[PDB]
Write a protein that binds this ligand. Structure first.
Ligand SMILES: *C(=O)[C@@H](NC(=O)c1cccc(O)c1O)[C@H](O)Cc1ccc([N+](=O)[O-])cc1
Ligand SMILES: *C(=O)[C@@H](NC(=O)c1cccc(O)c1O)[C@H](O)Cc1ccc([N+](=O)[O-])cc1
Ligand SMILES: [Zn+2]
Ligand SMILES: [Zn+2]
Lengths: 400, 400
């Protein structure tokens, strides 16, 4: 149950000293990553987010306007061109505010939700690096919500719902929640902090989430909620964050015209659910020990012959399943059927399809799961439909 | 017919002096971009490529092993961490060789086809920058094919087919092809250059492509084929490239076990079809003058009411088309119908659905195209079918 070993075994990714803390995603790991992308994007549609893409580097002058340069310059990668300094982005928030600043906005346009699978880079100390979980380059399931003060509590609600929707998809039901209150050095008045912390507290109350305070741990520009999921070994993983921000939009001249036709600065909410997706793939690898749910498995089906008397029946079925959008391969090698099955069982393929002449003539397939339960011979059309239903529903469990 | 003007009008992207030559994709531009990802990915499945992802930055020591540092150091962004120098990748090729170098390779594994949507960054002089077309940061529809010398012809064939397949989808039918022959300073023997030049020449000959030589214009490590498409204004756009490489894999220690059990160095084919995807979106924007085919339109359908007495029929219709995978939005605003319709015609929405009492009771919609043609009241399920078919087939033409 160690993702670095499973990662090498299943050929998912590798890393090397020429690029410390930066992942090389091989075909099969990248398939997991992209399947996560598709799932998140399905959520962005359902919860009505825009998806944008910002540039990898911006002028360091801009990073000073944010105030982040003064605090976290050392975690930043800088480069040069024509006598200007640029930083490679460690976060997506200012870029999103830059998208927001194009075109006059109106209260009509808020809440405005803006997501990005944003590639970030942080100059992490090399000795702290570890596999997929402490890296220098990661991708974040990142969104920012611009809204009015009246819309905060409804927008946080939506984020809270999103969190439990997505964690439960992976079997994570034990979640611990913490609210981080005002730190010693902060901006804003005590009254503004009073209602900011109240909005986060009330949102969790309307959702029936018990929670607990992390006193003084809040950012200098707002409180936050932090979500911690527990894996099947009862290790805690902080993944989710909803973070209120009353400083950045004003620092970057974001404004909208209000109901009263006066100019107003929007509230910004920062939220990620998986957090860093390389890290989340790491958790999943260990939570599942490599036996990924069908919808995540790099290879969902392998089809095998008994003799060469079925090689083309296999090939036609491989094609048939592929047209159904199933990641399927054929194993027509001249090896014993128990050799092939161990090969693909070691590779954690969810379903092994075997065709003898017994089943070639009837139009069926014999079906074996990776755990070793034999489901016998079923009609191909019924097998394909049952596979699709399992994939579309992102089922954690296989057939029976 | 200028993409930069159209780009601001349709709210596709923007750029700013804080990040010269780097694109901010807004929601509507990023929809186009992502839809091109899905189209390329459809082809990657059909032509059987792996899709991988390499790290964004790599040790400059590795970039010296490739020989690219001597020639192209001035084009590279470089950065420091703990007293090591790193280049942001201007290209994906060395990263893919790193992926190939994990695990011993046998001749059985070739041809190995490896694609990536690679984020590259080149320190282009700022005075040369222009729109989406000459930039500092861009994404490439990249792939590398590792094969044996006996396998080159069939692989180049496969690349030549893919080029004509994709360009055809967009309506580019006039394509000019040029073969760059050996340069004055080069690696390899004349005998090997003779077979390599003939390899590219034979592959085009088998696919009936006439072509022309670009004498002496080859890279020092191989000949190439370059494809130039002509747009509807009859301007020439060089997009596709097929580069044979007989130097890089040996310099980076690639090797396989041959069928004679002697270890050999593989051939690399470098291969891009659209080239820079930003640039391609720019060409498409000018090629269509913003009237994107339905499968690329950021918003495919707008539904509208006559009065308020249909606001809910519109809303259920909107959800009904959303579930069908159609990018549809509803316009329930209190405005005249000719005002709404002009609004969405200026935005180049392909289809405009309108609902009064007549269509609500009947379960139909009045359908209007952006050209201005009325298609009348057809059944809702028949117009969803026709939209799906037009989208799935990536048709350039609309209904009728
Ligand atoms: C303050 O805003 C805080 N942001 C977040 O924690 C955050 C969470 C989830 C999504 C988004 O978009 C967020 O911004 C601040 O960015 C924290 C921070 C700590 C360290 C570094 N660093 O460069 O090592 C950057 C930002
Ligand atoms: C030599 O290999 C040449 N590559 C290509 O032309 C190429 C075309 C399409 C796809 C791929 O993957 C390719 O590698 C070489 O890369 C030429 C070149 C490299 C770097 C720069 N630079 O501005 O740093 C310019 C040209
Ligand atoms: Zn943020
Ligand atoms: Zn290349």
């Amino acid at each position: 149950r160690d993702h670095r070993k499973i990662g090498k075994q299943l050929d998912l990714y590798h890393m090397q000293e020429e690029a410390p803390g930066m992942v090389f995603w091989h075909n099969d790991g990248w398939t997991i990553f992209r399947e996560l992308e598709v799932f998140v994007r399905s959520k962005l549609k359902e919860y009505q987010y825009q998806e944008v893409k910002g540039p990898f580097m911006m002028d360091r002058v801009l990073w000073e306007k944010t105030g982040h340069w003064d605090n976290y310059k050392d975690a930043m990668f800088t480069t040069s061109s024509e006598n200007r300094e640029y930083c490679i982005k460690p976060m997506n928030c200012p870029g999103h505010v830059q998208i927001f600043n194009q075109g006059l906005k109106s209260y009509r346009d808020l809440p405005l939700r803006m997501a990005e699978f944003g590639s970030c880079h942080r100059n992490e100390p090399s000795g702290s690096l570890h596999g997929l979980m402490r890296v220098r380059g990661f991708t974040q399931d990142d969104a920012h919500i611009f809204c009015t003060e009246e819309q905060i509590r409804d927008e946080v609600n939506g984020c809270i719902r999103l969190v439990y929707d997505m964690y439960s998809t992976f079997g994570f039901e034990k979640i611990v929640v913490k609210l981080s209150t005002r730190p010693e050095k902060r901006i804003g008045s005590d009254e503004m902090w009073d209602r900011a912390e109240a909005d986060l507290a009330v949102a969790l109350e309307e959702n029936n989430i018990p929670f607990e305070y992390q006193l003084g741990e809040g950012a200098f520009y707002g409180p936050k909620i932090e979500f911690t999921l527990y894996d099947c070994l009862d290790r805690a993983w902080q993944c989710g964050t909803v973070q209120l921000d009353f400083s950045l939009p004003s620092r970057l001249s974001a404004s909208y015209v209000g109901e009263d036709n006066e100019r107003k600065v929007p509230v910004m909410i920062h939220r990620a659910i998986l957090g860093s997706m390389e890290r989340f793939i790491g958790i999943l690898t260990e939570e599942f020990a490599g036996f990924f749910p069908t919808w995540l498995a790099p290879v969902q089906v392998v089809i095998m012959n008994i003799t060469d008397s079925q090689s083309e029946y296999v090939n036609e079925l491989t094609q048939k399943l592929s047209n159904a959008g199933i990641r399927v391969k054929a194993d027509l090698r001249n090896e014993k059927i128990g050799f092939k099955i161990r090969e693909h069982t070691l590779r954690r393929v969810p379903y092994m399809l075997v065709c003898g002449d017994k089943e070639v003539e009837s139009g069926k397939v014999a079906v074996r799961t990776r755990r070793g339960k034999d489901l016998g011979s079923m009609d191909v059309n019924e097998v394909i439909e049952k596979l699709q239903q399992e994939i579309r529903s992102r089922s954690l469990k296989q057939l029976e």
